[PDB]
Design a protein around this ligand. Structure first.
Ligand SMILES: CC(C)[C@H]1NC(=O)c2c[se]c(n2)[C@@H](C(C)C)NC(=O)c2c[se]c(n2)[C@@H](C(C)C)NC(=O)c2c[se]c1n2
Length: 1182
């Protein structure tokens, strides 16, 4: 039910098609065992011919005839065999695939529309809860997973019937009890295999979780980069915990990694066992009873039943994860909670006009426990009026405004619009009859003409023309290029909020309600706009009764009636004057305000050379690799022998030949493997260990030393970096392992394959090499075609998913609701295309997979038939075919390698390139000389000649053009610009974070941008806006280890003293030991600054860089800061930049710089004597 059924709901000819295919799949897997039985019949007639060929020394003619007759006889059996099994595979395959598609296809599609629309119907709730971020996320993600659920499933039913039926069919029909001995030994061995292997595979899981832990403890904080450069360099810590947990869980999970190699070894060991019991049980039940040297069929075949149950396993899984998540989020899908709104039929009020009535409504927010914001609200408002609400403590006003669109249904009491109860009239009809405008003027990524249109589908640019003209916007739109058909550059980020809101005005305007609501629309907008806007707001009001909650008492004056609120506490009501007269709430309050990347340059073999560098040595590794390969073709050889010696050889010692080879297999495979692996696992594994660890150490430091425009102007977040750390150390690891695997399979396949290939027979060697590289190329192109369709599909669906998102993310839409479907409709359109396209590609996968399989039987037809070729009187085509097919097996072993081990080397290398390009870098300012700190450099006079610069993005026109400043010693250089840039950049330039484009600086005499970077940052009293202190203790923080500076106790005492933070240091549990406490979230910015300053003075600068230090503080914080800073200055030079046009007075040389160029300068009153820039600044101040 629910889970699975719903999960597969909705398909007539679909469900039928689904079944159909299913069947196909069945006949398919089964098709493979049949294939095995056959190899039986052919291998048996073949064995007969070889045994009589063994007797020989007699009737030469009777032999020409018996062997030719049997040759052509089976040569035919082969024709009709591959013809059979073959044609089959092809056909049904293509079919099962169509299941996959068609099925999931239309399925998903359906689920698609029903989900979009679903969300667009869950209403309020999608604002109520959800992450409405995480939602569209799961939108796309989940939908897809459901799909993969439908297709892989098909594949599952498949291999499920391949194992079940095959292992049955053969595992019971051929043997009678022999097939049963098979069942005995084979299944039992399959058990022990899957068991032990899986037990230690999960032991690997546990080891990997122990890793992730070691990982984060190998992560730490790596942001706060800037403050860090102005600090020095962590470098030990990182490395410490780094390699620490690394090496530990390294050897450890590498013990389970090597144990994983102990697993590939346990499985292979047991493999050998498979052989052991296999051949043994055979040799016996093939020498005594059931003498057919064809037990091979049954036994081998059931093996196939096992491996098919495996593949079956991952497929099922996908059906699960798909089933599970799909149906659960499906429940959050098809489900139609709604009912607190909905969108259909309802009550129709043609009466047009009416009065708003709020009759005792008790409302609690959707957050259950949240205290009812409308602890009983009574408020009626006549038509034609314009009532405003006033509050301040948040949540109540906007709340009423809110439920006026029926948004949240009232918890109790009710509200009657016009004279009928809001809850009784149709919702759409309501929402349309209710024009509203909140603060956020949301605009869609389209043209103005549109946004408007959105407000109302049908409408001619004519009406829009007037509408806007009325919403007074017909001007900027005009002066705006493209006219009405002007887009809004990806979202509502291309014009002033004033304009935006305005447009909206227009929007809702064209809606022309009867009830207009303004949720502090004007709010959050410059004064000027504020006026023009209010203006429009008015022009649209008064013909429409309107309620308005705002803070601009100024725009509250023209109120036909004011509403007393301040967080959900109704009170005084009536005209402005009446409330002022009431000297209550109004009066008072009125008087209270008066992650993408991808880089072209890769790195061919470069990673392999730098590979070796990051490697001491491990021939031992490559060695065991090689021998390992040799080990594989070996089994190949030996097997051929076994089957051969027994299918055509001498009757005596048949048991010694059998007991020998089978025993051999065992010792050979099992022992050399478990050993070859373990051994390598240890070597190559340790390889990845150091490589990673060491790699990190370098990469990280490379960053530490790195810096300038890097973190100064980065687009490489702290995460992206940290990640880079982990992932890439790991990926290169995969680079060395691959290289290992490469040499391996190679010599394995290539080498041994060719050797045995020379002892071939020249018919087989060639026909087969044609077959392996060919089916190989068909597999690679198979994948390629598959990723392609997958990629392009993700792009069309993307577009569709981007818009859809835009709507759900921007629920505001609902405000007009005049688009829901309209929207989804447009998406139906896009969806429409990738749906027909999903069909085409469907068929595709079909023909592809099929053609694959084709190549399969085909290859077998050629192989066996071409092998057996001419065998009249005994020709060079006998048992050797085994070895030949061993070469086919060899190609298939190489496939086992590229489908296993370290990643496809691809992402491995790309990630390798990244870590390289980074570990490399260009230091730019590490150690050096470039000064000697002569006992007479302790001045501090800063010089700025030319000063032209502009952090990386030069075509944005430099923010430093021909600048020039200067500053004496032991004084305070005042600095004030226009805003943001200029101030900080200079400070920066001093810190030499960015070497100016043209010009230079002089901290005292020598040339800054030549002086010693290290020392120039040794003396520096830096304290910018947003401070910061690592999750250390204040004592340590205060004692900021700039360099060899040993945490000087009495020194730091000096820091808390002057800094003015000794207050928190006095008492407050632990005194100096208190860790910032949870990364710092326990001390006010004032405090943190106090420690900031402590830092500076702790370094005893000769220059103090104050970057608006206190610029988001308050009482005694700004005061105590300016005082500590007061004694913190004057003994040593200090450029103090700031936007405190008030406390800047106390300055020696105040410099008024107009971004790029300084315009005025000198002493305060003097600048005031210069009525102009500085003047207009203190006057705007007031
Ligand atoms: C592929 C199916 C037709 C069929 N095999 C043959 O017809 C065949 C004819 Se000679 C022979 N197998 C012997 C012999 C060469 C030693 N094979 C191996 O020692 C060997 C070692 Se790993 C490996 N195979 C992988 C690889 C090949 C995928 N194959 C299978 O798990 C598998 C399961 Se059923 C099956 N194969």
């Amino acid at each position: 039910v629910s889970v699975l059924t719903m999960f597969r709901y909705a398909g007539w000819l679909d469900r039928l098609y689904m079944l159909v295919g299913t069947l196909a799949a069945i006949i398919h897997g089964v098709a493979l065992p049949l294939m095995m039985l056959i190899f039986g019949d052919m291998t048996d007639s073949f064995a007969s011919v070889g045994n009589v060929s063994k007797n020989s020394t007699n009737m030469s003619e009777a032999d020409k005839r018996a062997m030719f007759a049997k040759l052509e006889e089976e040569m035919t059996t082969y024709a009709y065999y591959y013809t059979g099994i073959g044609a089959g595979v092809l056909i049904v395959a293509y079919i099962q695939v169509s299941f996959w598609c068609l099925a999931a296809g239309r399925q998903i599609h359906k689920i698609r529309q029903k989900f979009f629309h679903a969300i667009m119907n869950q209403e309020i709730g999608w604002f109520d809860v959800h992450d409405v971020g995480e939602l569209n996320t799961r939108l796309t993600d989940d939908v897809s997973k459901i799909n993969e659920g439908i297709g892989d499933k098909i594949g599952m039913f498949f291999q499920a019937m391949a194992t079940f039926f095959g292992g049955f069919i053969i595992g019971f029909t051929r043997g009678w009890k022999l097939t049963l001995v098979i069942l005995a030994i084979s299944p039992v061995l399959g058990l022990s295999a899957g068991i032990w292997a899986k037990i230690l595979s999960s032991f690997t899981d546990k080891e990997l979780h122990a890793y992730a832990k070691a990982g984060a403890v190998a992560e730490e904080v790596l942001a706060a980069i800037r403050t860090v450069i102005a600090f020095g360099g962590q470098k030990k810590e990182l490395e410490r915990y780094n390699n620490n947990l690394e090496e530990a869980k390294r050897l450890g999970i590498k013990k389970a990694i090597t144990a994983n190699i102990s697993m590939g070894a346990a499985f292979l060991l047991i493999y050998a066992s498979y052989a052991l019991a296999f051949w043994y049980g055979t040799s016996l039940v093939i020498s005594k009873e059931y003498s057919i040297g064809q037990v091979l069929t049954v036994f081998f075949s059931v093996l196939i039943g096992a491996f098919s149950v495996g593949q079956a396993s991952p497929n099922i899984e996908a059906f699960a994860n798909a089933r599970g998540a799909a149906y659960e989020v499906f429940k959050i899908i098809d489900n139609k909670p709604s009912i607190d709104s909905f969108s259909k039929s309802g009550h129709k009020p043609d009466n047009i006009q009416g009065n708003l009535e709020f009759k005792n409504i008790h409302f609690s927010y959707p957050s259950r426990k949240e205290v009812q914001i409308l602890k009983g609200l009574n408020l009626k408002v006549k038509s034609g009026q314009t009532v405003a609400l006033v509050g301040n403590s948040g949540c109540g006003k906007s709340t009423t405004v809110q439920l006026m669109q029926r948004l949240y249904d009232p918890l109790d009491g009710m509200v009657s619009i016009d004279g009928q109860d809001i809850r009784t009239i149709n919702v759409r009809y309501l929402r349309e009859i209710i024009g509203v405008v909140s603060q956020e003027p949301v605009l869609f990524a389209t043209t103005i003409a549109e946004n408007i249109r959105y407000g109302r589908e049908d409408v001619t640019m004519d009406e829009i023309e007037k509408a806007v003209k009325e919403a007074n916007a017909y001007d900027f739109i005009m002066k705006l290029p493209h006219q009405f058909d002007t887009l809004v550059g990806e979202r509502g980020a291309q014009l002033s909020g004033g304009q935006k809101q305005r447009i909206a005005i227009a929007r809702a305007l064209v809606r022309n309600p009867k009830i207009l609501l303004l949720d502090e629309a004007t709010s959050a907008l410059d004064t000027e706009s504020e006026a023009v806007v209010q203006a429009a707001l008015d022009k649209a009001r008064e013909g429409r009764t309107t309620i308005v909650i705002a803070h601009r008492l100024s725009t509250v004056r023209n109120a036909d009636v004011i509403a007393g609120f301040d967080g959900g506490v109704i009170v005084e009501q009536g005209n402005h004057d009446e409330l002022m007269r009431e000297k209550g709430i109004y009066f008072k309050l009125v008087m209270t305000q008066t992650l993408d990347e991808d880089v072209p340059p890769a790195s061919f073999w470069r990673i392999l050379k730098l590979n070796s560098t990051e490697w001491p040595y491990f021939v031992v590794g490559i060695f065991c690799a090689i021998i390992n390969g040799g080990l594989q073709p070996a089994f190949s050889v030996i097997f051929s022998k076994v089957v051969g010696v027994f299918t055509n050889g001498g009757p005596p010692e048949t048991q010694r030949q059998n007991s020998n080879l089978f025993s051999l297999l065992f010792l050979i495979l099992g022992i050399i493997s478990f050993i070859t692996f373990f051994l390598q696992g240890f070597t190559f594994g340790k390889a990845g260990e150091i490589l990673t660890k060491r790699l990190r150490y370098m990469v990280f430091k490379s960053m530490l030393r790195q810096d300038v425009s890097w973190f100064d102007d980065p687009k490489n977040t702290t995460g992206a970096l940290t990640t880079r750390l982990a992932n890439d150390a790991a990926q290169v690891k995969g680079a060395t392992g691959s290289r290992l695997a490469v040499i391996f399979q190679n010599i394995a396949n290539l080498g041994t394959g060719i050797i045995i290939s020379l002892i071939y027979g020249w018919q087989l060697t060639l026909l087969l090499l044609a077959i392996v590289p060919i089916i190989a190329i068909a597999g690679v192109v198979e994948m390629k075609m598959l990723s392609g369709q997958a990629l392009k599909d993700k792009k069309e669906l993307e577009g569709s998913g981007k818009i859809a998102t835009e709507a759900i993310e921007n629920f505001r839409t609902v405000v007009s609701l005049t688009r829901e479907q309209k929207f989804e409709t447009m998406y139906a359109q896009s969806l429409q295309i990738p749906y027909r396209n999903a069909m085409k590609k469907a068929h595709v996968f079909g023909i592809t997979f099929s053609f694959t399989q084709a190549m399969m039987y085909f290859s077998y037809a050629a192989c066996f038939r071409f092998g057996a070729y001419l065998v009249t009187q005994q020709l060079m085509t006998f048992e050797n075919v085994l070895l030949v097919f061993s070469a086919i097996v060899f190609g298939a072993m190489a496939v086992g390698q590229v489908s296993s081990f370290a990643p496809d080397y691809a992402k491995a290398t790309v990630s390798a390139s990244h870590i390289i390009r980074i570990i490399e870098k260009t230091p730019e300012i590490d150690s050096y000389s470039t000064q000697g700190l002569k006992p007479n450099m302790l001045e501090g006079n800063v010089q700025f000649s030319g000063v032209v610069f502009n952090y990386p993005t030069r075509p944005s026109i430099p923010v430093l053009q021909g600048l020039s400043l200067e500053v004496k010693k032991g004084q305070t250089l005042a600095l004030v610009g226009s805003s943001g840039c200029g101030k900080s950049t200079v400070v920066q330039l001093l810190e030499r974070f960015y070497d100016p484009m043209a010009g230079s600086v002089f901290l005292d005499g020598k040339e800054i941008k030549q002086l010693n970077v290290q020392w120039l940052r040794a003396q520096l009293g830096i304290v910018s806006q947003e401070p910061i202190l690592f999750d250390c203790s204040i004592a340590e923080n205060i004692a900021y280890g700039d360099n060899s500076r040993v945490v000087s106790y009495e020194e730091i005492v000096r820091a808390a003293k002057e800094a003015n933070i000794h207050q928190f240091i006095d008492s407050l549990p632990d005194k100096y030991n208190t860790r910032v406490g949870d990364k710092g979230t326990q001390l006010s910015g004032g405090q943190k600054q106090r420690i900031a300053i402590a830092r500076a003075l702790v370094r005893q600068p000769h220059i103090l860089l104050l970057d608006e230090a206190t610029s988001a503080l308050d009482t005694e914080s700004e005061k105590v800061v300016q005082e500590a800073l007061d004694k913190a200055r004057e003994g040593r030079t200090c450029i103090v930049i700031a936007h405190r046009l008030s406390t800047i007075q106390n300055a020696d040389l105040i410099v008024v710089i107009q971004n790029g160029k300084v315009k005025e300068h000198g002493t305060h009153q003097q600048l005031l004597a210069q009525k102009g820039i500085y003047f207009s600044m203190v006057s705007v101040q007031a």
